[PDB]
């Protein structure tokens, strides 16, 4: 998912639903990974201001709200806190 933003420090204060694109049949064991940075050059290099966030997925049960137009607008993480647990059960 790609979105506009005008915040500089930390995550957005909101919620966005990710769409699929790709589903490549590579058949590869993956345990480690890495990111590919760039160099502005003119050791003779400089790096522009960029920030990347990494978060490990976990096996969880979620609840999803599909609006009338068919896009996810809200969700609940069951087992986050008791309130979300009750929203999950009910």
């Amino acid at each position: 998912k790609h979105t506009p933003i005008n915040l500089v420090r930390d995550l957005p204060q909101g919620f966005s639903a990710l769409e699929p694109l790709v589903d490549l049949p590579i058949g590869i064991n993956i345990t480690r990974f890495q990111t590919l940075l760039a160099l502005h050059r003119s050791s003779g290099w400089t790096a522009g201001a960029a920030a990347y966030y990494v978060g490990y997925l976990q096996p969880r049960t979620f609840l999803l709200k599909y609006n009338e137009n068919g896009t996810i607008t809200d969700a609940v993480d069951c087992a986050l806190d008791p309130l979300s647990e009750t929203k999950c059960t009910l």
Binding site: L11, T35, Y53, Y56
Partner: protein, 44 residues
């Protein structure tokens, strides 16, 4: 409301960091970026 490890590269030291990370049955990768620096990934 999890905790995600923040990494960033800033001119300012110069803070060049992009180490190898574990890939434990999934990764969520978000980039707040302006000038096309966070561009690709390795997996293995």
């Amino acid at each position: 409301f999890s905790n995600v490890t923040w990494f960033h590269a800033i001119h300012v030291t110069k803070r060049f960091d992009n180490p190898v990370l574990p890939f434990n049955d999934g990764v969520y990768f978000a980039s707040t970026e302006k000038s096309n620096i966070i561009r690709g990934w390795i997996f293995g």
